[PDB]
C-alpha cells in the first residue's frame, strides 16, 4: 500500500496503488483507495482495509450534516479533524493510515496527514503505507518549490512507480486525482501507461 | 488397562485385560498383555506398548545368555533387577512401563513390580494400569492365603471384570495364568461380554 | 520455529485368510488442504510372501522402506534364506524402536503369509509395538473402516449367524465396499484404491477408481 | 467451501459448492450455501456454516422490512451497507464471508464482504477454502460483457476447480442467475461426483440383533 | 476436549414411512463410569424425539428449556408442533449462547404431523441445522458411527428392517469408542405404534 | 598408546609368554588347599619371612567375599591386581544379582580375566 | 480429601461420609459432620471447596425450608434434586461458579426410597449406588459385586463395613470416623459412628 | 536453515510430448522487499537433467555447487554411465531427508525435469523429504493458483506439444503475477529435450488491466 | 509421603522408618523395608525419589562393603557419613542428580553413638535427633519437648510411640506401622514393630 | 547504517555512514565502515558490530595467505568467495550484511552482494544496512548505465545524505573510497560538505 498528495498553487493531486494484500495472497489488485468524502475533499486509505472504509463513511456522514447546518462549503482542515478525532480516540482499535487532500474557497489546497498515533499536521507533501518507506530518499531530492499541476501529476506518478516496484504489499495500478476550483478530474494509468525505470542487470 | 498379579500357596495368579485405546478410539481389544518372557518368567502390559514389549524382550534375551553361561536358572530377583536398571538409564525421558514380573524361584513363589520411574519391589499382590483401583477393591475383599486353586482362578477373573465394567480404558478378554515350580500355564481367555452372561444367572 | 512432521493422509487396509492376505490402500497424498498426487500408492511388495503398508508422514515412509529393502539384502547375504513375514514383522519393531525419542509419524500394517500358508497380518503404530490379527485398518479413515470390519469379518453383535469362512472373492468386495463409504466421508481417502494380493502363485494389484473430489 | 460471483452484460452469476465439513470429516453431501436476501439479491456463504446462516436471515428480515415500508424494491448497496456496519461492530468474531450479488435499477453489483466489515466492489469475487483455485479460472478465462450461457459456464468450471484441488470442497455445483427480468435459482446444475453403487449389499436380517426388553405405545 | 469428557453417541435414521433414534446409555466422567441407565432421548410431541449428545449437564440443561419453549408454543397455538419449526426452535436456543454455547449437538428424529412425512436432522453447538434424507449422527465416535450408517443404509426400509439396520450401525460403533456404551436404546417412531429396545451390548 | 603384540604364537605352536608367566609362578611360594566334608583349608608353604618383617601384611590367604576366599603363587604384585579386581566384581554382581556371589561365576572372572590378557594389545 | 457413599434398599437409603476436615497436611477436626438436613426425610451429602461447601448446601436447605413453610408440605427427594441441579447450572457459566460435588438422599411417601449423584458441573443422575471423591475408585467395584435390589438393612451396613474397611487398607488418607445415618419412612435415624 | 531470508516463489513444471517445461521467475524477495530482480534460480544438472527450486536462494547456490561438482566427477571418468533423472531425485530426497533429521534443514522446494531414454520425468522434493511423481507440478502459491489451471488442461488432452505447454505456462505466470504479492514480471523458460537443456532469457508476459474502470 | 524419624541417646541409637510404599491414590506394600545394612553397626535410611531411592543407596552399600573386604576392617561413622555425601554433591551438578533425603545412623567403637541428617542436596550436618518428610513437621517439637542427652532407650521408644501417635491423629496420610531397630555396643537389633 | 557500492567502466566507487548505534544512543559518530582486505579489495559492513569485525579480519587472513601461494593478485570474487563461506556456514550465529566490492587485472571493476542469508550475486550498484531501505526510489531513478568515476562519487554522497537524513540509525560523515589500477583513494565529507537538501516547510 502507497498513498501519495501533494499540494500545489490551485488545489491538491493526490495518488495511489491498487494492490490490497492479505498475507501473501492479493485479495484485489485494484482497489480504490481515494475515497471522496465532499465535492472537493478526498481521502486515502491505508493499514486494515475494515478499520479504513468504516471511518471514512462516518466522517462522510458526519461533514455532510456539518456543511448543511452551517449552509457554507465545508472546510479541508474541518474535514481532517473528524478523521482525526476518530483516530485518537479509537487508536489502540483502529489500524489506520489517513492522508486528507482536499480544496475550499477560504484556504484553497490542502493536505493533511494523520498517522496512527491520531496526530494532525498540515503538510507540503504526505507519503503513507508500506511502500512509502521505499521513496523517502526519493521525494526529497526530487520535490521543488512552486509546482505546477501538471508537473505534480508528474510528481506523484512517478514516486508510486518506484514504490510499487519494490514493495510487494504494493503494486497494481496507479490511480491519480486532481482537484482545484473547477471540480475534481481523476484518471488511472495501466499497465504500459506505468513510468518504466530500468532495471540493474550486467 | 488392567493387570494384576497375586501370590498364594499354589502358585502365583497372573490376570490382565486386552483392551489398547488411542484417545477415545479403540486401536485393538485382543492385545496379548501377558508378556511371555520365558517357559517360567512371565510379565505385564501397562502404559506403553512397545515400551513394555522391547525391554521385557531385551529381558528374555538376558535371562537366556544368564541360562548358557551359569548352567541354572535366572532368580526372579534378578531378573527384576535386570530390567529395573535398564530402563534407570533412561529416566525422565519418555519411558512408561508399570510391569510385574512372576516366577517360581528357589526361595519360593516371587512376585515383582518393576516401573520405568525406577520403581522395584516385593510384595504378596499388585494390580498395574488405569483400572488398577477398581481391581484393588474386590481382590482384598477376597483374598487368601490358604485359597484353593479354582478359587485363585475365580478371584482374578472377576477382579479384571469389574475393572472392566467402571474403567473405560479397560475391556476386550480376560487372560489368566498360573505360575507352578515347573512353569506357567495358560489357564483361559474368556470374554467380557461371554462373563458378563455367566455371573448373571 | 521449525516442524519436521507433516499429516499426509492416506489410509491402508488388510484382512487375513486361510491361504490368502490383501494389502490395500488409497493413491491419495496431500498436504493441508491441497492434494499433492493422485497417484501414489501406499502398498509395497517386498519379497514374495510380504507386502508393506506405510500410512502418516510420507517423507518417512519413503526412507523406511528404503531401510527395509536395503536389510532385506543383509538378511539374504548372510543367511542364504528369503526373510519371513514373522521375521520382517519382528526386525520392523526394531527399527521402529531404534527411533523411540525421534519417532517415524507412521502407521505400518504388514500382510503375508507364514510357514504354514495361512494368511498373516500385523499391526504396528509409530514406536514399534506389534501384534498378529484378521484384521486392520489404519490411517485417516481407520476410524470409519473397523467398525464395519468388526462386524462382518468378526461377526460381532450378530445373534444367529453360520460363521462363513473367509473366501478372496468374498474379501476383496469387502475391500472395495469400506474404502467407496470411507471416500464419501473422510477427505484424504479417495482418487484410487489399489488392492494387492498375497497367494501360494504370488502377488497380483488391482485398481479401482474412486471420488476425484 | 468454494463460492463465487461474476457480473455479465445482463446481470450476475453466483456459485457455490455443497460439501460441508466437520473437521476433517463430511457432514453434509448436500448443503445450500446460496442464500435468500430479497427477491432480485441473492448471497454465497462461507467461514463458520451458523454464523453465515443468522447474519443472511437477519439482513433479509431487515430488507422486507425495509422494502414494505418504501414500496419498492431493494438495493445492493443497501444489502452491502447492513452487512458492513454489523459485522465491523463484532470486530470480525462473526466469522462470515459473504459474496454478495443482485440487480437494481442502477444495474449489477457485485460485493465480497470479510468477516472483520471490509467491502470490494468487483466484477468477479471468490471467497472460501478453495477460493484459490476458483480466482486462477477468473484471471484467465473472464472476459467484459459476456453472454449468460458463457458466463455460467465461467463459473461452474471455477466452483469446480475448487472442488477437486481443495480438499475442503466437493460434491455438486450450485448456480444463481440473477437478470434484470429474469431470475434462475439451478440448485443442482452439473454432479461431477457419485457414490460407487454398493455391489455387496450389507442388509441385516430380520432377528439378528439381540433384544433385552421391549415395549410398544399405541398412537392416534 | 470439552465434548469427550461425559462421551455418548446418538443417531437418527429415516426409512419408509417411519424414523429411528438410538443413543448409548452410558454416563461416565472422564473414564470411570457411573450410570448405567442415563437418558439422551426425550419426547417432543407424541411423534417427535430430540437426542443430546456431549456435556452431560448441556444435555440436560437443553431439554428442559426447550421443553419450557415447546409447552407456551403449544398452549398460545391450538396445534403440535411441526420437525422444522422445532429444528428452528433449537437453532434459535442455541445460538442465544453465541459467545458461550451448550456443549452439545441436538439430533431431531420424527414423523411429521398430519402429513406423515419422516424427518431428521442434526444441529452445532452454536446451532447449525442440517437436513438429510438418510442420516445424522452426532457424539464422540461421530467418524466410527458414519462409516457404519454409510454401508448398512438402504433408501426405502419397513419400520422392521430399519430397527435392525440403526442398531447394528450404533453397536458396532459404540463397541469402538471407549468413552461410550452400557447399552442401546432404540425409539422406532410409526404412525401407529412407539416401539421402544434396549439392546444387549458390551458391558466394557 | 601402546599396541604392540606381546604374546604370539611361535613355530612350534607355543605361546612363549604364556609359558614364561608359568614359570614364574613355579618359583613362587608353595599353596596347597584340600576339600573336606563340611569345611575347605588351604595353606601357604615357604613363608621365608626374616621373623624381622611383619607377618600381616605379607598373607597370601585373601577373601573376596564373605563365602569365597583364595590363595595365590608367584609375582604378589600381579596378584594384589587379580584380588582386588575380583573383590569388586563380587559387589558388581550384587548390584545385578541380587544373590551372592558362587564359586563357579568367580573363577569364571578370574579365568577370562587372565585370558585377555595373553590375547591383547601392550599386555 | 473427602469422601461420600450412598446405598439404596427396597424402602430405605443408607448414607456414609468420613469425619476429616482437612488442610494441607494437617486433620484439623475430628468430627465433622457432611451431612445437611433438608426436610424430615431428605438429607444431603456436600462435597468440594473450602468455601464454596458451606454457602450452597445451606442456601438450598434454607430454600427448601422456604417452601415448607409457605405451603404446609415439604419438597418430593425428586423436586429437591431438581433445584438443587437448577442453581448449580446457572451459576455454571456466571462469574461466581460452586466447584461441589453433592450426594441427594431421599424417601418419598409415594415413591419410596431415592439417590442421587450430582457432578460438579450440575449433572444429574438416579443411582442404586453412588459414591464420591478418590476412595470411590476403589469401593465401587466392591458396591458391584456383592449389591442386590433386595438387600436389608442388616445387610447394607455389613456391604457398607467391607468399603470403609478397604479405606483403611489401600487408600493413602487417613479416614478413622464415618457418619452412617439411615433414611427411611419415619424419617432420619442416626447410626453408630464405626470408628477404626 | 532456521530462518529463510531471501526467498524465491513459485516454481512451475509440466512435462510434454519428448520433454519437459520449467519455469521460475527471476527474484529474490527479503521479506516482503524485492531485492534482486536478476537472478537465475534455475540450473542445468547435466544434459538430461534440470533443476529449480523455491525458498531460500542461499540454500539452492550451496546445492548448486553439489550438483555442479557431482556431474563434474562423474564426466571425469568417461565409462559411458550418467545420473538419470530419477538418480538426481533420489539423492534429492535423501539429501533434504538427512538435514531434515538433522534438526538443521535445507529451506528449499524443488522441481526435477528429466528426459531419458525417450521418457519424460517430473519429480517434486520438500524440505523434509516428501516425494513424488506427477505430470504437472507447482511450489508455493503456485499450487494453489496455477496447479488447478495445470489439471483441467490435462483432464482433458494428456499428452501436449512443446507449443501448446508454453503457452499454458505463460498463462499460468500471468495469475501468478495478478494473485502472488512476492513476484514478478520476469522469468526464465528452460526446456529439456533429446538435443540437452536450454534456458531462455528474460521473458515477461503481457498483463491486461481492464477491471480498473468497471467498478461503478 | 514417606516420613523417618531418629533419636541419639548416650550409648545407643533409635531409628524407625514407615512401611508405606505408596503411588497415587494407593497403598502398593504394607511392609516395605526403608532401612539399609551398610555394615554391622551402621544403618542407611533413604526417602525420596521413586528410582533414586533404591539405586544410590545399593550403590553407597556395596562401595562401603568393598571397603571392608580391600581392607579387613570397616568404616566409622563418620567416614561412612562423610563418602556417601560426596557421591551425591558431585552427581548434584552433573547430568543425573539423585533426589534423595537420607539419615545415617551408627556406632563408632571410639566415638560412640551417631546421627547424621542429609539433604537432596547433599548437606550434612550431625544432630541428636532428626525426622525426614511432612511428618517431621509434627514429630520435632515434640522431640524438642521431651528429649534430654542421658535418655534411657526404655523412655525413647516410649518418646519415638509419642511421636507416632501424633500421626494417627494429625498426619493426613495413612501410616499404620513403623519397623524400629536399635543400634548399640552389639550392634544392630530388630524391635518389635509399633502398629496401630 | 547505510552501505553503498557503485560498479564504474575503470573499478569502483564504494561509499558508507558513520553512525553505529546501541539502541537509540550513539557509541561512535566516527566509525569506519570501509574495510581493507588487500592493495585493491574493500568490504562495507552492516549489522552486528561484533560480528562483522570478525569475520573481515579473518577474510584477510584467509586472503592474505592465498594471495601468496598463487602468486598471483587476487579476484574480487575470490575475496567475495571467502565471506560467503563465512557467512552461509554460521548464518544462525552472525548477524552480517557485507557487499564487497574492488578491482582486479583479470576483470576489472566487481561488486558483490552477501546479505543476511549467505547467499553470493555480482550487482552493478548495491546498498544494504537499515538506511539503505529509504533510498530504494532514488536509486532506482536516479542510475544511469555507464557513469564516469565522477559521476558515481556524486551519485553515491547523494543517496548516502538521503538515508541518513529520514533514517534514525544512520547519521554522521559520509566516508567515500574510488578503487581503479592507480590503487585506493578516499576522501571524508565533512558537515557542510554533505549533499544539501530542502525541507518542505509551509
Tied chains: 1, 10.
Excluded at chain 4, 458492513?84 to 464482504?113: C, E, N, W
Excluded at chain 4, 452439473?190 to 433384544?211: D, F, H, Q, W
Excluded at chain 5, 407456551?72 to 396445534?79: D, I, S
Excluded at chain 7, 430405605?12 to 469425619?19: H, M, Q, T
Aim: some cysteine.
Amino acid at each position: 500500500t502507497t498513498i501519495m498528495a501533494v499540494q500545489f498553487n490551485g488545489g491538491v493531486v493526490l495518488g495511489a496503488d491498487s494492490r490490497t494484500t492479505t498475507g501473501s495472497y492479493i485479495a484485489n489488485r485494484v482497489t480504490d483507495k481515494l475515497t471522496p468524502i465532499h465535492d472537493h475533499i478526498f481521502c486515502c486509505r491505508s493499514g486494515s482495509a475494515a478499520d479504513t472504509q468504516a471511518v471514512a463513511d462516518a466522517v462522510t456522514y458526519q461533514l455532510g450534516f456539518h456543511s448543511i447546518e452551517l449552509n457554507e462549503p465545508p472546510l479541508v482542515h474541518t474535514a481532517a479533524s473528524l478523521f482525526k478525532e476518530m483516530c485518537y480516540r479509537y487508536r489502540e482499535d483502529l489500524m489506520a493510515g489517513i492522508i486528507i487532500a482536499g480544496w475550499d474557497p477560504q484556504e484553497g489546497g490542502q493536505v493533511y496527514s494523520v498517522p496512527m498515533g491520531g496526530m494532525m499536521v498540515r503538510q507540503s507533501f504526505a507519503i503513507g503505507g508500506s511502500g512509502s518507506s521505499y521513496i523517502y530518499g526519493y521525494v526529497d531530492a526530487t520535490y521543488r518549490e512552486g509546482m505546477t499541476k501538471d508537473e505534480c501529476l508528474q510528481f506523484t506518478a512517478n514516486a508510486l512507480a518506484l514504490a510499487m516496484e519494490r514493495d510487494g504489499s504494493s503494486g497494481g495500478v496507479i490511480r491519480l486525482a486532481a482537484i482545484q476550483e473547477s471540480g475534481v478530474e481523476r484518471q488511472v494509468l495501466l499497465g504500459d501507461q506505468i513510468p518504466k525505470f530500468t532495471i540493474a542487470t550486467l | 488397562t488392567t493387570t494384576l498379579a497375586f501370590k498364594f500357596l499354589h502358585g502365583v495368579i497372573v490376570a490382565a485385560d486386552s483392551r489398547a485405546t488411542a484417545g477415545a478410539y479403540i486401536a485393538s481389544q485382543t492385545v496379548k498383555k501377558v508378556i511371555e518372557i520365558n517357559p517360567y518368567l512371565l510379565g505385564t502390559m501397562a502404559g506403553g506398548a512397545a515400551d513394555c514389549s522391547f525391554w521385557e524382550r531385551l529381558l528374555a534375551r538376558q535371562c537366556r545368555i544368564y541360562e548358557l553361561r551359569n548352567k541354572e536358572r535366572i532368580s526372579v530377583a534378578a531378573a527384576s533387577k535386570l530390567l529395573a536398571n535398564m530402563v534407570y538409564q533412561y529416566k525422565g525421558m519418555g519411558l512408561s512401563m508399570g510391569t510385574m514380573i512372576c516366577g517360581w524361584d528357589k526361595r519360593g513363589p516371587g512376585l515383582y513390580y518393576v516401573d520405568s520411574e525406577g520403581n522395584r519391589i516385593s510384595g504378596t499382590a499388585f494390580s498395574v494400569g488405569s483400572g488398577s483401583v477398581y481391581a484393588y477393591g474386590v481382590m482384598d475383599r477376597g483374598y487368601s492365603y490358604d485359597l484353593k486353586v479354582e478359587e485363585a482362578y475365580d478371584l482374578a477373573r472377576r477382579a479384571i471384570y469389574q475393572a472392566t465394567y467402571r474403567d473405560a480404558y479397560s475391556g476386550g478378554a480376560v487372560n489368566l495364568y498360573h505360575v507352578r515350580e515347573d512353569g506357567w500355564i495358560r489357564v483361559s481367555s474368556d470374554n467380557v461380554a461371554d462373563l458378563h452372561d455367566k455371573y448373571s444367572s | 520455529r521449525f516442524s519436521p512432521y507433516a499429516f499426509n493422509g492416506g489410509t491402508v487396509l488388510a484382512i487375513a485368510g486361510e491361504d490368502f492376505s490383501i494389502v490395500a490402500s488409497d493413491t491419495r497424498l496431500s498436504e493441508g488442504f491441497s492434494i499433492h498426487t493422485r497417484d501414489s500408492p501406499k502398498c509395497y511388495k517386498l519379497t514374495d510372501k510380504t507386502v508393506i503398508g506405510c500410512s502418516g508422514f510420507h517423507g518417512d515412509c519413503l526412507t523406511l522402506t528404503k531401510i527395509i529393502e536395503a536389510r532385506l539384502k543383509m538378511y539374504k547375504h548372510s543367511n542364504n534364506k528369503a526373510m519371513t513375514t514373522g521375521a520382517i514383522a519382528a526386525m520392523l519393531s526394531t527399527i521402529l524402536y531404534s527411533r523411540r525419542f525421534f519417532p517415524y509419524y507412521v502407521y505400518n500394517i504388514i500382510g503375508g503369509l507364514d510357514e504354514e500358508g495361512k494368511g498373516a497380518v500385523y499391526s504396528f503404530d509409530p514406536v514399534g509395538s506389534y501384534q498378529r490379527d484378521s484384521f486392520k485398518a489404519g490411517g485417516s479413515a481407520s476410524a470409519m473402516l473397523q467398525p464395519l470390519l468388526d462386524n462382518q469379518v468378526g461377526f460381532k453383535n450378530m445373534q444367529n449367524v453360520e460363521h462363513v469362512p473367509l473366501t478372496l472373492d468374498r474379501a476383496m468386495r469387502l475391500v472395495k465396499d469400506v474404502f467407496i463409504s470411507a471416500a464419501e466421508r473422510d477427505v484424504y481417502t479417495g482418487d484410487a484404491l489399489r488392492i494387492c494380493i498375497v497367494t501360494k502363485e504370488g502377488i497380483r494389484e488391482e485398481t479401482v477408481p474412486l471420488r476425484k473430489d | 467451501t468454494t463460492i463465487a460471483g461474476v457480473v455479465y452484460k445482463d446481470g450476475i452469476v453466483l456459485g457455490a459448492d455443497t460439501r460441508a465439513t466437520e473437521g476433517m470429516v463430511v457432514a453434509d453431501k448436500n448443503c445450500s450455501k446460496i442464500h435468500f436476501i430479497s427477491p432480485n439479491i441473492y448471497c454465497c456463504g462461507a467461514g463458520t456454516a451458523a454464523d453465515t446462516d443468522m447474519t443472511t436471515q437477519l439482513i433479509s428480515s431487515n430488507l422486507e422490512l425495509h422494502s414494505l415500508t418504501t414500496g419498492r424494491l431493494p438495493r445492493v448497496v443497501t444489502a452491502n451497507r447492513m452487512l458492513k456496519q454489523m459485522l465491523f461492530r463484532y470486530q470480525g468474531y462473526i466469522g462470515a464471508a459473504l459474496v454478495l450479488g443482485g440487480v437494481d435499477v442502477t444495474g449489477p453489483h457485485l460485493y465480497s464482504i470479510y468477516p472483520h466489515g471490509s467491502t470490494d466492489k468487483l466484477p468477479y469475487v471468490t471467497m472460501g477454502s478453495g477460493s484459490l483455485a476458483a480466482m486462477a479460472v477468473f484471471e484467465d478465462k473472464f472476459r467484459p460483457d459476456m453472454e449468460e450461457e458463457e458466463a455460467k459456464k465461467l463459473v461452474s468450471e471455477a466452483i469446480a476447480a475448487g472442488i477437486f484441488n481443495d480438499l475442503g470442497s466437493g460434491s455438486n455445483i450450485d448456480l444463481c442467475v440473477i437478470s434484470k427480468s429474469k431470475l434462475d435459482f439451478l440448485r443442482p446444475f452439473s454432479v461431477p461426483n457419485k457414490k460407487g453403487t454398493r455391489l455387496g449389499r450389507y442388509r441385516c436380517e430380520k432377528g439378528t440383533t439381540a433384544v433385552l426388553t421391549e415395549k410398544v405405545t399405541p398412537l392416534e | 476436549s470439552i465434548m469427550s469428557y461425559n462421551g455418548g453417541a446418538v443417531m437418527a435414521m429415516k426409512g419408509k414411512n417411519c424414523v429411528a433414534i438410538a443413543a448409548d446409555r452410558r454416563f461416565g466422567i472422564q473414564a470411570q463410569m457411573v450410570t448405567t441407565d442415563f437418558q439422551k432421548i426425550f419426547p417432543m410431541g407424541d411423534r417427535l424425539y430430540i437426542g443430546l449428545a456431549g456435556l452431560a449437564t448441556d444435555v440436560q440443561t437443553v431439554a428442559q428449556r426447550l421443553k419450557f419453549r415447546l409447552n407456551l408454543y403449544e398452549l398460545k397455538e391450538g396445534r403440535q408442533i411441526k420437525p422444522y419449526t422445532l429444528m428452528s426452535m433449537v437453532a434459535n436456543l442455541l445460538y442465544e449462547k453465541r459467545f458461550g454455547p451448550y456443549y452439545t449437538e441436538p439430533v431431531i428424529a420424527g414423523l411429521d404431523p398430519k402429513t406423515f412425512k419422516p424427518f431428521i436432522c442434526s444441529l452445532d453447538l452454536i446451532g447449525c441445522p442440517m437436513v438429510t434424507d438418510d442420516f445424522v449422527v452426532s457424539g464422540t465416535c461421530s467418524e466410527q458411527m458414519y462409516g457404519m450408517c454409510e454401508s448398512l443404509w438402504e433408501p426405502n426400509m419397513d419400520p422392521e428392517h430399519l430397527f435392525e439396520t440403526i442398531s447394528q450401525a450404533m453397536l458396532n460403533a459404540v463397541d469402538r469408542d471407549a468413552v461410550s456404551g452400557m447399552g442401546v436404546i432404540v425409539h422406532v417412531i410409526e404412525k401407529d405404534k412407539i416401539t421402544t429396545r434396549t439392546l444387549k451390548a458390551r458391558m466394557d | 598408546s601402546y599396541d604392540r603384540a606381546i604374546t604370539v604364537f611361535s613355530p612350534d605352536g607355543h605361546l612363549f609368554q604364556v609359558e614364561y608367566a608359568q614359570e614364574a609362578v613355579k618359583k613362587g611360594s608353595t599353596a596347597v588347599g584340600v576339600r573336606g566334608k563340611d569345611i575347605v583349608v588351604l595353606g601357604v608353604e615357604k613363608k621365608s619371612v626374616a621373623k624381622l618383617q611383619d607377618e600381616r601384611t605379607v598373607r597370601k590367604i585373601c577373601a573376596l567375599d564373605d563365602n569365597v576366599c583364595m590363595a595365590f603363587a608367584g609375582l604378589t604384585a600381579d596378584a594384589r591386581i587379580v584380588i582386588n579386581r575380583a573383590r569388586v566384581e563380587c559387589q558388581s554382581h550384587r548390584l545385578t544379582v541380587e544373590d551372592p556371589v558362587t564359586v563357579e561365576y568367580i573363577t569364571r572372572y578370574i579365568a577370562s580375566l587372565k585370558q585377555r590378557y595373553t590375547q591383547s594389545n601392550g599386555r | 480429601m473427602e469422601y461420600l457413599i450412598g446405598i439404596q434398599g427396597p424402602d430405605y437409603v443408607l448414607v456414609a461420609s468420613d469425619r476429616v476436615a482437612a488442610s494441607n497436611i494437617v486433620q484439623m477436626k475430628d468430627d465433622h459432620d457432611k451431612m445437611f438436613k433438608m426436610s424430615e426425610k431428605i438429607l444431603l451429602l456436600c462435597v468440594g471447596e473450602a468455601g464454596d461447601t458451606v454457602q450452597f448446601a445451606e442456601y438450598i436447605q434454607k430454600n427448601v425450608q422456604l417452601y415448607k413453610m409457605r405451603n404446609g408440605y415439604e419438597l418430593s427427594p425428586t423436586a429437591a434434586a431438581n433445584f438443587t441441579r437448577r442453581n448449580l447450572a446457572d451459576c455454571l457459566r456466571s462469574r461466581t461458579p460452586y466447584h461441589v460435588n453433592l450426594l441427594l438422599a431421599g424417601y418419598d411417601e409415594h415413591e419410596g426410597p431415592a439417590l442421587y449423584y450430582m457432578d460438579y458441573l450440575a449433572a444429574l443422575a438416579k443411582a442404586p449406588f453412588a459414591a464420591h471423591g478418590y476412595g470411590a475408585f476403589l469401593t465401587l467395584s466392591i458396591l458391584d459385586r456383592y449389591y442386590t435390589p433386595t438387600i436389608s438393612r442388616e445387610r447394607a451396613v455389613e456391604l457398607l463395613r467391607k468399603c470403609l474397611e478397604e479405606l483403611q487398607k489401600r487408600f493413602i488418607l487417613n479416614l478413622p470416623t464415618f457418619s452412617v445415618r439411615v433414611i427411611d419412612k419415619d424419617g432420619i435415624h442416626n447410626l453408630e459412628n464405626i470408628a477404626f | 536453515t532456521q530462518n529463510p531470508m531471501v526467498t524465491g516463489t513459485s516454481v512451475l513444471g509440466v512435462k510434454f510430448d519428448g520433454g519437459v517445461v520449467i519455469a521460475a521467475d527471476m527474484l529474490g524477495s527479503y521479506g516482503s522487499l524485492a531485492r534482486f530482480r536478476n537472478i537465475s534460480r534455475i540450473m542445468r544438472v547435466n544434459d538430461s537433467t534440470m533443476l529449480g527450486a523455491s525458498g531460500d536462494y542461499a540454500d539452492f547456490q550451496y546445492l548448486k555447487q553439489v550438483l555442479g561438482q557431482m556431474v563434474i566427477d562423474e564426466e571425469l571418468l568417461g565409462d559411458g554411465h550418467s545420473y538419470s533423472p530419477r538418480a538426481i531425485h533420489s539423492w534429492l530426497t535423501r539429501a533434504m531427508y538427512s538435514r531434515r533429521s538433522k534438526m538443521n534443514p535445507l529451506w528449499n522446494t524443488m522441481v526435477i525435469g528429466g528426459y531419458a531414454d525417450g521418457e519424460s520425468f517430473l519429480g517434486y522434493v520438500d524440505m523434509l523429504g516428501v516425494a513424488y511423481e506427477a505430470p504437472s507440478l507447482a511450489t508455493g502459491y503456485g499450487a494453489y493458483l496455477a496447479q488447478p489451471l495445470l489439471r483441467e488442461v490435462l483432464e482433458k488432452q494428456p499428452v501436449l506439444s512443446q507449443t501448446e505447454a508454453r503457452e499454458l505456462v505463460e498463462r499460468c505466470m500471468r495469475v501468478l503475477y495478478y494473485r502472488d504479492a512476492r513476484s514478478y514480471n520476469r522469468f526464465q523458460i528452460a526446456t529439456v529435450t533429446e538435443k540437452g537443456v536450454e534456458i531462455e532469457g528474460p521473458l515477461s508476459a503481457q498483463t491486461n488491466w481492464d477491471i480498473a474502470h468497471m467498478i461503478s
